Ligand binder design. Structure first.
Ligand SMILES: O=C(Cc1cccc(O)c1)Nc1cccc(Cl)c1
Length: 186
């Protein structure tokens, strides 16, 4: 099946807890995969304009590890719940992808999660301005704009709204698209 095939692909790239005990400032992100209309999608958030860091920008759910978290996957799930109302029973964490080093002292660990088909986002408006899906295949043929660094522009055909996706968020989206969609018969 589509989902069993995606999970099997993802597991081959799992680094697990290899880098998890290193003494960094630690954040986790959830790369949430949603199956709709017979295709896989990634779920993104638009950060509230009220936030200090990166107001109005597109990013994955997640946040800073806190002492309650059993592990880095727990960070991602706790923060996703706070931000978009995703409950742990609504997500199957499939793997941990390559962590992202930033600012010399920070390590961001991405987890890919399969999201229940009945999930409907309940965003905290203090943190999240918007939630939207992008088909995973978009990231194989994105609409690229140069700002010099590459920015993706995705227009939702449901409503004509264009979102800019860039940086780590764009990079991770492409990675997941490659992992899951490469070398597939039609
Ligand atoms: O903070 C994150 C995870 C995260 C961490 C580090 C970098 C990055 O792009 C995303 N995500 C989020 C998304 C919406 C609102 C709020 Cl309040 C936070």
């Amino acid at each position: 099946s589509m989902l069993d095939d995606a999970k099997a692909r993802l597991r081959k790239y799992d680094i697990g807890g290899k880098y998890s005990h290193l003494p960094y400032n630690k954040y986790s992100v959830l790369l949430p995969l949603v199956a709709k209309e017979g295709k896989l999608h990634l779920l993104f958030t638009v950060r509230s304009e009220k936030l200090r860091r990166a107001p109005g920008e597109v990013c994955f759910p997640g946040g800073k590890r806190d002492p309650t978290d059993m592990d880095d996957a727990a960070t991602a799930l706790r923060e996703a719940q706070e931000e978009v109302g995703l409950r742990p029973h609504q997500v199957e964490v499939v793997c941990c992808l390559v962590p992202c080093l930033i600012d010399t002292d920070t390590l961001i660990t991405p987890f890919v999660g399969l999201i229940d088909h009945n999930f409907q986002a309940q965003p905290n408006p203090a943190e999240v301005k918007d939630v939207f899906l992008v088909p995973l295949a978009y990231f194989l043929h994105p609409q690229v704009h140069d700002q010099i660094n590459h920015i993706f522009e995705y227009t939702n055909p449901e409503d004509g709204v264009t979102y800019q996706i860039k940086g780590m968020t764009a990079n991770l989206a492409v990675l997941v698209a490659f992992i899951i969609l490469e070398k597939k018969p039609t």
